[PDB]
Swiss-Prot record, chain B:
UniProt GO cellular component terms: cytosol; DNA polymerase III complex; DNA polymerase III, core complex; replisome
Pfam families registered for this protein in UniProt: RNase_T (PF00929)
Cofactor(s) for this UniProt protein: Mg(2+); Mn(2+)
UniProt keyword list: DNA replication, DNA-directed DNA polymerase, Exonuclease, Hydrolase, Magnesium, Manganese, Metal-binding, Nuclease, Nucleotidyltransferase, Transferase
Note accompanying the cofactor annotation: Binds 2 divalent metal cations. Magnesium or manganese.
UniProt protein name: DNA polymerase III subunit epsilon
Gene: dnaQ
Catalytic activity: DNA(n) + a 2'-deoxyribonucleoside 5'-triphosphate = DNA(n+1) + diphosphate
Subunit structure: In a ternary complex this subunit contacts both the beta sliding clamp (dnaN) and the polymerase subunit (dnaE). The DNA polymerase III holoenzyme complex contains at least 10 different subunits organized into 3 functionally essential subassemblies: the Pol III core, the beta sliding clamp processivity factor and the clamp-loading complex. The Pol III core (subunits alpha, epsilon and theta) contains the polymerase and the 3'-5' exonuclease proofreading activities. The polymerase is tethered to the template via the dimeric beta sliding clamp processivity factor.
NCBIfam families tied to this protein: dnaq (TIGR00573), dnaQ_proteo (TIGR01406), PRK05711.1 (NF004316)
Binding, substrate: 6, 8, 55, 60, 161
One MF term in the entry's GO annotations: metal ion binding
Chain segments annotated as coiled-coil in the UniProt record: none
Function: DNA polymerase III is a complex, multichain enzyme responsible for most of the replicative synthesis in bacteria. The epsilon subunit contain the editing function and is a proofreading 3'-5' exonuclease. Contacts both the beta sliding clamp (dnaN) and the polymerase subunit (dnaE), stabilizing their interaction.
Swiss-Prot record, chain C:
UniProt protein name: DNA polymerase III subunit alpha
Organism for this UniProt entry: Escherichia coli (strain K12)
Segment of the intact protein contained: 1 to 73 of 1160
Name of encoding gene: dnaE
Subunit structure: The DNA polymerase III holoenzyme complex contains at least 10 different subunits organized into 3 functionally essential subassemblies: the Pol III core, the beta sliding clamp processivity factor and the clamp-loading complex. The Pol III core (subunits alpha, epsilon and theta) contains the polymerase and the 3'-5' exonuclease proofreading activities. The polymerase is tethered to the template via the dimeric beta sliding clamp processivity factor.
Annotated compartments: Cytoplasm
Bilayer-crossing regions: none
Biological role stated in the UniProt entry: DNA polymerase III is a complex, multichain enzyme responsible for most of the replicative synthesis in bacteria. This DNA polymerase also exhibits 3' to 5' exonuclease activity. The alpha chain is the DNA polymerase catalytic subunit. It is tethered to replicating DNA by the beta sliding clamp (dnaN), which confers extremely high processivity to the catalytic subunit, copying a 5.4 kb genome in 11 seconds, a speed of at least 500 nucleotides/second at 30 degrees Celsius.
Family named by the database record: Belongs to the DNA polymerase type-C family. DnaE subfamily.
Superkingdom of origin organism: Bacteria
Length: 145, 218, 73, 217
């Protein structure tokens, strides 16, 4: 979807809505993150940020009772934003499917920043960065190699 | 009366039943009475019913074609049974030899029970392991330990090991013995005070209110 | 009266490390299977299982009893 | 295994017996049916022993704030920390004005939850600690928990990531609509522990500071 090989939808061909565009913009309509789950509850269905975090938590636990209630809040929240009910619920099913793998963006980002730093240094002055890398794992002969 | 054996075979299975699909080639045992060799050695070679394994061949050398005309376990079943029945069976890695023995016994279909039911099988390795923990307790290891050569001796196979093991066995189980030698009545009962009982009540209240049970108050 | 004539007052969990074997929850569940209302653990020079003892005591309505064993000179 | 010996080693101490199992009440009652006092004294001692340790609930600490609230010290350092970051990110003052409202709204929304949950002293300690170790040569570990979703953490130089740039959410990290602890689980490079132990002892007291054991299992 990034390279134009398939139509981009927000998130699905049928089950998409343009109000999800600001939320799903960075990922080309793909549900990747825990934080996107929370932004969808905020934007689509009028959740507070804290109530949105409570939905993501409830999706981790996967309990029978628990969803039943939020499933209702998510319905009338979308209704309150004028958004179609069947669409709202069919997207909720997809959110919940992909929530299983859904990763913590802030945890990924803190570490990814460090990757980018190692990347930039090596590109601009690997003439030292490399030296540093060697020095760090001097102890390991395999890594040194 | 004490019976010494060591059986080298047509190789072994590394996994599972070391005896399954395999057969005995030579039986070489010495009989030991009052810690001495009478010289009544029972040394026989039997029918392979199969090929000698490359492993066994390298151990002390032996050709399959030599054990072809030689009789099967069925021809010396009674002969060997009476020779060892109701005596002391000292073996190295007893699980190996006994496993083969009982295997062959069942193959005869002669109602002959397992040798371990009428003879006391005792492992020398267990004893050696107790005496020398974490040390190599193989035959050749103990051999070198007590400065016995089993490598430059013409006997290759059972009779070799039997003889050597006998000497080693006796040495370890001789070695030098040792001399060595190796309710009513009145009594106070501090009973908890009323203040301690108040603390107890309060503490049980905590258990019960937080946990939903207290067996002391049940 | 209720049940108690006796409770065990010197017992080690695996947290003693010099000795003991059973983990803390399983020790508590055995005491209860024996119909005992409380439980002393006197681990060797530590309170490592105490936090877990109190969490398990609360959960089961069992009163935890405070103890530990040491060496003197 | 503890002593380093094998079972059948003669040198091994043999102070223990097969009777040292979880005997029942009745089994002990019969073992000592000649000394009933001995059983009964267990019951008695056990009832005299009553220790309250409350668990799972916190105790807070502080920072020299003068005669000021710790709350108010935080409000001050956060507004002014925000000012540093804003001049670094948008060194054009026209842009800083147009881009600013989002940050101020984020800032006070967070500030409300931090102060109403009773956090401010804790975050102050940590931010100062993080700053001092940057000034000096103390490597800080990559980890931030979900702390990258706090723009206040970023403003205060607690973190290194702009959460507003990357749509990072504070409520994963501290949720006001749920008692959410201060799990914030901040790390630093273990090589430079001695330097940090030192600073935080000067700060709070060597006796108020300790390492935490892990385990060999």
């Amino acid at each position: 979807r990034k390279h134009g090989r398939e139509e981009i939808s927000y998130p699905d061909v049928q089950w998409q809505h343009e109000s999800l565009k600001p939320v799903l913009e960075p990922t080309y309509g793909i549900i990747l993150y825990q934080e996107q789950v929370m932004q969808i509850a905020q934007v689509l269905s009028g959740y507070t940020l804290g109530g949105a975090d409570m939905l993501r938590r409830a999706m981790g636990k996967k309990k029978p009772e628990e969803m039943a209630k939020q499933r209702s809040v998510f319905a009338e929240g979308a209704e309150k934003n004028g958004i179609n009910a069947e669409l709202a619920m069919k997207i909720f099913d997809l959110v919940e499917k992909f929530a299983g793998y859904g990763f913590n963006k802030s945890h990924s980002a803190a570490y990814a920043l460090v990757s980018y730093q190692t990347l930039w240094l090596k590109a601009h002055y690997p003439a030292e960065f490399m030296a540093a890398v060697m020095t760090a794992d001097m102890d390991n002969t395999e890594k040194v190699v | 009366r004490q019976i010494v054996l060591d059986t080298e075979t047509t190789g072994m299975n590394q996994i599972g039943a070391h005896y399954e699909g395999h057969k005995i080639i030579e039986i070489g045992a010495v009989e030991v009475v009052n810690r001495r060799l009478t010289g009544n050695n029972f040394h026989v070679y039997l029918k392979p019913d199969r090929l000698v394994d490359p492993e066994a061949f390298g151990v002390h050398g032996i050709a399959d074609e030599f054990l072809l005309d030689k009789p099967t376990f069925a021809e010396v079943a009674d002969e060997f049974m009476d020779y060892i029945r109701g005596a002391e069976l000292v073996i190295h890695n007893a699980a190996f030899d006994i496993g083969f023995m009982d295997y062959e016994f069942s193959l005869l279909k002669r109602d002959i029970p397992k040798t371990n039911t009428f003879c006391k099988v005792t492992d020398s390795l267990a004893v050696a392991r107790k005496m020398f923990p974490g040390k190599r307790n193989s035959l050749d290891a103990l051999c070198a330990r007590y400065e016995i050569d089993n490598s430059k001796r013409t006997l290759h196979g059972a009779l070799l090991d039997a003889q050597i093991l006998a000497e080693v066995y006796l040495a370890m189980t001789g070695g030098q013995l040792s001399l060595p030698l190796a309710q009513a009545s009145k009594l106070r009962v501090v009973f908890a005070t009323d203040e301690e009982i108040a603390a107890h009540e309060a503490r049980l209240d905590l258990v019960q209110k937080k946990g939903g049970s207290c067996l002391w108050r049940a | 009266m209720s049940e108690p004539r006796f409770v065990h007052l010197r017992v080690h969990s695996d947290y003693s490390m010099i000795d003991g074997l059973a983990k803390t929850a399983p020790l508590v569940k055995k005491a209860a299977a024996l119909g005992m209302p409380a439980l002393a653990i006197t681990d060797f020079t530590n309170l490592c299982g105490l936090v877990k003892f109190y969490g398990a005591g609360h959960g089961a309505g069992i009163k935890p009893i405070v103890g530990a064993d040491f060496n003197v000179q | 295994i503890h002593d380093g010996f094998t079972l059948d080693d003669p040198k091994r101490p043999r102070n223990y017996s097969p009777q040292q199992y979880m005997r029942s009440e009745e089994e002990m009652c019969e073992l000592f049916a000649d000394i009933p006092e001995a059983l009964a004294n267990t019951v008695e001692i056990a009832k005299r022993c009553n220790v309250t340790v409350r668990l799972g609930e916190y105790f807070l600490p502080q920072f020299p704030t003068g005669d000021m609230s710790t709350e108010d010290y935080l409000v001050k350092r956060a507004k002014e920390g925000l000012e540093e970051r804003l001049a670094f990110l948008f060194p054009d003052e026209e842009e800083r004005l147009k881009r600013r409202p989002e940050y101020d709204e984020r800032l006070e929304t967070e500030l409300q939850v931090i102060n109403q949950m009773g956090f401010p002293g804790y975050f102050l300690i940590v931010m100062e600690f993080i700053q001092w170790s940057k000034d000096n040569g103390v490597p800080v570990g990559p980890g931030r928990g979900s702390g990258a979703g706090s723009l206040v953490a970023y403003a205060l130089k607690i973190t290194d990531l702009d959460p507003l740039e990357f749509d990072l959410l504070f409520e994963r990290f501290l949720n006001p609509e749920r008692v959410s602890m201060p799990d914030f689980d901040v790390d630093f490079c273990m090589e430079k522990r001695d330097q940090v132990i030192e600073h935080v002892a000067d700060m709070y007291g060597r006796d108020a500071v300790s390492q935490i054991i892990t385990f060999g299992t």
